[PDB]
């Protein structure tokens, strides 16, 4: 059970998967107890005219 607990903390739970500019107004909330280590953010290249989330040049 301890091994499962630490492994489940390590693999993490996805908060948002998809794509958005993350501009003014958008936000995300969660229970504080779900946070044990921290948060991770992944960004990618985007198209303003086409509005399709290209998949490369991640950060």
């Amino acid at each position: 059970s301890a091994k499962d607990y630490v492994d489940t903390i390590g693999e993490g739970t996805v908060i948002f998967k998809g794509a958005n500019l993350m501009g003014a107004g958008q936000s995300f909330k969660w229970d504080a107890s779900k946070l044990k280590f921290g948060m991770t953010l992944l960004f990618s290249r985007y198209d303003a005219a086409n509005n399709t989330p290209q998949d490369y040049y991640y950060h």
Partner: protein
């Protein structure tokens, strides 16, 4: 031989339909695509000449 129907139980894999204006349930894939990018500001006109509605 017994399966879920004979014992009057739900299947191992099953769906509960979407949640409507008066019924609970899941959310349509469109709903999930809507909520994540849904934004707070809705603006509008709050009052004109001291009258609302």
């Amino acid at each position: 031989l017994l399966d879920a129907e004979d014992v009057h139980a739900a299947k191992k894999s099953h769906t509960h339909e979407v949640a409507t204006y008066t019924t609970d349930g899941f959310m349509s894939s469109f709903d999930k695509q809507k909520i994540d990018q849904l934004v707070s500001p809705e603006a509008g006109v709050t009052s004109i000449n001291g009258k609302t509605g």
